[PDB]
């Protein structure tokens, strides 16, 4: 058997593997199975927060009308997160997914410009997208981090899906080393459980100039990459459809008719 420790380790593991829009169900299921809430509260605590940070969970702060992403880049420690757009800390509830207690906070010009071009870009290409841009120093180097989350939750028709992109431009003028991770997940669960799991890595090096000029190049670069990714995915679906699937099971035998089981059993 296993300890109550290993039990929550298992419980936490399951939660962080909750599919988009299904955190509440996975949570309800696990908590019933663990059957020990203060063990859950204690043990899965780190899980809840990871889930929201990994998933780039979006949240509305009453007062601002730009939704902010929970991301480990916004993690201010001690329950709070940063909103770089409006320069605020807010308390965040990982199970309710609510922001509260907005407080003021203290590459400004580049994150601003990048942010502007990215909002434009997101509103044009993602039906329900949000984004969040960070400017900070990672071990001596100045970096822009642009996260994008977009989803469609259709619980009543047993399906959910989510796109996340995360772009890191570490800036060493006149060059910027570009890193990005692209992730898409789709789950359809009517009379089954089918999931798409996809992700692509990008490493590149780029030119750098002025805040505003540079921002636009960054967004034009991002748009391009996310088209290749999306296009290639669509191509994969097509090859899978008309080539690979057909090689698995025929639609009918070569006799163009169903089986004669009398003949079979002879």
């Amino acid at each position: 058997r296993v300890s109550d420790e290993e039990k929550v380790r298992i419980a936490a593991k399951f939660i962080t593997h909750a599919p988009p829009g299904e955190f509440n169900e996975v949570f309800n299921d696990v908590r019933l199975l663990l059957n020990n809430d203060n063990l859950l509260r204690e043990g899965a605590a780190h899980a809840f927060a990871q889930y929201n940070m990994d998933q780039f969970t979006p949240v509305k702060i009453e007062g601002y009308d730009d939704q902010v992403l929970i991301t480990e880049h916004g993690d201010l420690g001690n329950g709070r997160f940063l909103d770089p757009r409006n320069k605020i800390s807010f308390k965040f509830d990982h199970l309710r997914k609510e922001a509260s207690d907005p407080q003021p906070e203290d590459l400004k010009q580049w994150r601003d410009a990048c942010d502007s071009a990215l909002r434009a870009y997101v509103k044009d290409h993602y039906p329900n997208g949000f984004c969040t841009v960070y400017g900070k120093s990672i071990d001596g180097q100045q970096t822009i981090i642009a996260c994008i989350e977009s989803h469609q939750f259709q619980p009543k028709n047993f399906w959910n899906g989510r796109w996340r992109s995360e772009w890191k431009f570490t800036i060493t003028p006149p060059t910027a080393q570009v890193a990005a991770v692209l992730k898409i997940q789709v789950h359809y669960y009517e009379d089954g459980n089918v999931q798409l799991v996809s992700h692509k890595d990008i490493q590149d090096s780029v030119q750098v100039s002025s805040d505003v000029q540079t921002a636009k190049e960054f967004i034009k670069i991002i748009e391009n990459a996310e088209n290749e990714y999306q296009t290639a995915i669509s191509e994969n679906y097509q090859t899978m459809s008309d080539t690979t699937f057909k090689a698995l099971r025929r639609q009918l035998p070569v006799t163009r008719t169903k089986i004669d089981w009398n003949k079979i059993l002879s």
Partner: protein
């Protein structure tokens, strides 16, 4: 902690519950005994960090 909101309308049904049952003589020692699956680990770990 408490029960969180569900927007699914109805419970999911499990058809495999109602399958025929086969009584064994010796019960399992482990759930597995002695790749579907490729790329899936790094989906949950990959990060620009």
């Amino acid at each position: 902690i408490s029960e969180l909101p569900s927007e699914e309308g109805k419970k999911l049904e499990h058809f495999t519950k109602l399958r025929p049952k086969r009584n064994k003589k010796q019960q399992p020692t482990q759930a597995a005994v002695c790749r579907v699956d490729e790329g899936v680990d790094e989906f949950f770990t990959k990060k620009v960090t």
